Design a binder for this molecule. Structure first.
Ligand SMILES: Nc1nc2c(ncn2[C@@H]2O[C@H](COP(=O)(O)OP(=O)(O)O)[C@@H](O)[C@H]2O)c(=O)[nH]1
Ligand SMILES: [Mg+2]
Lengths: 322, 175
């Protein structure tokens, strides 16, 4: 409704789905789809649907074997299908059977079919907390944690025909971001953007762009000091980032043992940051991390995340874009 | 080869980063950012047997990063550290030991208790006997160390690997 209005939508009921973190949300038609995560007691592999226009929750209908319960996985939408890759699997309650994954599952929205894409040939290393996106009919995987060290390689796989597709490692050039995990990925125009994220000793508030066509990374410098422009957001991990119009919107995460709740906006065309001011009647959300975000039409949607003191949330907040 | 993943647990400012650097590179950090958590590697020969060590210097209190989460769950040994000049950190020792149980669902995970900053004998707020008493309560080795002058730094990590190899061999006997 109102521009720059933080609207608090009905949260997910407990009999529908458990309040969770480290999950994935993906937009299709005019509905938010939630898969996986951690409720605090066990890992999850259910599927929830939040009709944006109806403002109603629902357990999605799924046939076939779903992916093993997981969190820190990735989820993207290609055509009329959701593609889940990677993540952590195991048993939290007993700390057993714990292992990363490099499998690829497709969920046909139309029929509710869970299909595993059993890819032959060499695979990318099983990993979690990686970045993922879809561009030029291929699923792009980047960085993450494999179980022994943080990663910074990049792999692609065609999503057109599963029978003929295979994994391809990308020969990246340019200023590759250091080994990073728990970072957001948002595509804008013909470029992929990554901001901050947990990269160990090299954690910064740097912004990296990836041009798909030349497979080159570029660290966008900030002249905010010289031109009196707003400084970039504080370094953080477990935050979301979406792209709308010609702007990136960063929210949430844990910034130096703190959970800020400011909404930061990046003008990709004017290489400047901003702190968006919400409306007077805004229902501001609390500082959270390991939540997930998606964009439907001119609106951003936030779901879940650990609010504080390891309390899992199931709140649905909606921000209206200018 | 054998990869031992160890975790540095302790309250903020006890000297976790100072102890790590001294162990892996024989240096004392000048102005170390406390909000930095990363893992470091070294190959040392304990009891005439080489061992690959991967040590995570923990930082931050929010929900664990993917690296930390897997480290707390798959790490073979834990080093809980406090400062002898910080009684508050000496009390958090139990909260870290409880935390290991919440994740590992067991208290048999190898642990070494360390009271750091032993050179600060002028500002000592935790007696040496107390640390030993807490270590016998935990059934774990105890060391008073000084990362500033590298006192007993090697002995801490050497001991934990002995605890790991001891507990691993006791499992093989049962099987
Ligand atoms: N004198 C002395 N100072 C220490 C020792 N260990 C740490 N410090 C100091 O205490 C401060 C905190 O150290 P740091 O390693 O960053 O603590 P951490 O947050 O647990 O990693 C630093 O300024 C160090 O100089 C020690 O063994 N002796
Ligand atoms: Mg430190």
């Amino acid at each position: 409704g109102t521009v720059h209005r933080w609207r608090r939508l009905p949260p997910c009921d407990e009999f529908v789905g458990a309040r969770r973190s480290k999950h994935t949300v993906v937009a299709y038609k005019d509905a938010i789809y939630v898969f996986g995560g951690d409720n605090g007691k066990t890992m999850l592999n259910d599927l929830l649907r939040f009709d944006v226009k109806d403002c109603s929750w629902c357990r999605a209908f799924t046939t076939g074997t779903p992916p093993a319960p997981r969190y820190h996985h990735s989820a993207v939408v290609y055509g009329s299908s959701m593609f889940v890759f990677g993540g952590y699997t195991g048993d939290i309650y007993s700390n057993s059977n714990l292992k990363n994954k490099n499998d690829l599952f497709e969920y046909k929205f139309a029929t509710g079919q869970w299909t595993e894409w059993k890819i032959e040939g060499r695979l990318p290393v099983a990993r979690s907390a990686h970045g993922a996106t879809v561009y030029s009919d291929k699923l792009w995987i980047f960085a993450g944690y494999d179980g022994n060290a943080r990663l910074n390689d990049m792999w692609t796989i065609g999503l057109q025909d599963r029978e003929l597709t295979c994994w391809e490692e990308v020969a990246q050039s340019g200023e590759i971001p250091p080994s990073c995990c728990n970072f957001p990925v948002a595509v804008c125009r013909d470029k992929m953007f990554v901001f901050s994220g947990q990269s160990g000793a090299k954690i910064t508030n740097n912004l990296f762009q990836f041009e798909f066509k030349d497979k080159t990374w570029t660290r966008i410098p900030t002249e905010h000091l010289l031109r009196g422009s707003p400084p970039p957001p504080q370094r953080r991990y477990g935050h979301t980032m979406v792209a709308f119009d010609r702007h990136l919107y960063v929210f949430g995460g844990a910034a130096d043992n703190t959970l800020p709740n400011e909404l930061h906006c990046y003008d990709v065309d004017f290489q400047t940051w901003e702190v968006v001011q919400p409306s007077s009647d805004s229902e501001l959300p609390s500082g959270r991390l390991f939540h997930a975000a998606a964009v439907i039409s001119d609106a951003m949607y936030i779901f879940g995340g650990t609010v504080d003191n390891n309390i899992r949330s199931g709140e649905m907040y909606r921000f209206q874009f200018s | 080869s054998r990869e031992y993943k160890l975790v540095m647990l302790g309250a903020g400012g006890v000297g976790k980063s100072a102890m790590t650097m001294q162990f892996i590179s024989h240096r004392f950090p000048e102005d170390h950012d406390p909000t930095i958590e990363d893992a470091y590697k070294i190959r040392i020969r304990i009891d005439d047997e080489p061992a690959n060590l991967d040590i995570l210097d923990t930082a931050g209190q929010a929900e664990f990063t993917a690296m930390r989460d897997q480290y707390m769950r798959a790490g073979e040994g834990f080093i809980i550290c406090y400062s002898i000049t910080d009684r508050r950190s000496f009390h958090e020792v139990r909260e870290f030991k409880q935390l290991i149980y919440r994740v590992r669902r067991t208290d048999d995970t190898p642990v070494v208790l360390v009271g750091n900053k032993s050179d600060l004998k002028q500002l000592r707020q935790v007696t040496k006997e107390e640390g030993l008493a807490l270590a016998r309560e935990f059934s774990c080795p105890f060391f008073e160390t000084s990362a500033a002058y590298r006192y007993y730094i090697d002995d801490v990590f050497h001991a934990l690997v002995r605890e790991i190899r001891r507990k691993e061999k006791e499992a093989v006997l049962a099987m």
